[PDB]
Write a protein that binds this ligand. Structure first.
Ligand SMILES: CC(=O)NCCc1c([C@@H](C2=C(O)[C@@](C)(c3ccccc3)OC2=O)c2ccccc2)[nH]c2cc(F)ccc12
Ligand SMILES: [Zn+2]
Ligand SMILES: [Zn+2]
Length: 226
């Protein structure tokens, strides 16, 4: 998170810290608990192994609030496209249910057909970088404004307003960045978006997955692999 602040510890108890292991080494993503057995995140965060840490604030320290659960399945949308980054959405079926408590509990999703309009102020949180090339170990958050479609259509290779949200005012140095992918865009305490990607410079606007568009996929998947 660029241009944000440290979150109050455990104030976002749905936040999931993901460590993604692959032949390229280790990478970081966020995610969010949507039921006691499922974390929602971005498909590009897939790797050979995905370890989930729930209940965290400082991910460089053991904390008694933490729960460590490996993903039993990492279920990517069937139309995820690595080149265009379309359909950048994935569900992690946890290998066991969380122990629900005030530090670990799920966040609401939009209702069916519930939209999200340009101009809405939302919050994004994560453990990603705080500048183009510096990181952090504690959870941070920043408020960003939903942009009109045109802002992202003009500057990205592939953008679809039906499935994506365009987020962040270009004049403000405030953005999700590397390490934040998969985390939620919270608008009035509902997770309407998933951090996907932006420019390598960190200059907004950036692209989020529009959760409301994928509710059928989310619901069916959660039922099948409950
Ligand atoms: C290819 C691309 O569009 N890069 C943009 C830089 C960027 C990324 C990139 C990215 C990761 O997410 C990460 C940490 C990674 C994690 C897990 C597995 C692989 C890689 O390392 C990366 O470099 C990225 C990579 C692939 C697909 C989408 C995004 N995440 C962001 C999020 C933001 F909020 C703003 C800008 C970006
Ligand atoms: Zn704590
Ligand atoms: Zn740990």
């Amino acid at each position: 998170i660029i241009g944000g602040r440290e979150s109050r510890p455990h104030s976002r108890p749905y936040m999931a810290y993901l460590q993604i292991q692959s032949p390229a080494g280790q990478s970081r993503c966020g995610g969010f608990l949507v039921r006691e057995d499922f974390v929602l995140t971005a498909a590009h965060c897939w790797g050979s192994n995905i370890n989930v840490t729930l209940g965290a604030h400082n991910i460089q320290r053991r904390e008694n609030t933490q729960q460590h659960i490996t993903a039993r399945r990492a279920i990517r949308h069937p139309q995820y496209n690595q080149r265009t980054i379309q359909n950048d959405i994935m569900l992690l079926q946890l290998s066991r249910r969380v122990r629900r408590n005030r530090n670990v509990n799920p966040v609401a999703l939009p209702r069916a057909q519930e939209g999200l309009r340009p101009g809405t102020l939302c919050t994004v949180a994560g453990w990603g970088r705080v500048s183009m090339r510096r990181g952090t170990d504690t959870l941070r958050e920043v408020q960003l404004r939903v942009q009109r479609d045109r802002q992202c259509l003009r500057i990205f290779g592939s953008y679809d307003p039906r499935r994506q949200i365009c987020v962040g005012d270009r004049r403000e140095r405030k953005a999700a960045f590397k390490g934040d992918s998969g985390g939620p865009l919270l608008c009035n305490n509902v997770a309407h978006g998933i951090v996907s990607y932006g420019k390598s410079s960190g200059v907004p606007p950036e692209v989020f997955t529009r959760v409301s568009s994928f509710l059928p996929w989310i619901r069916t998947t959660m039922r099948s692999f409950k």
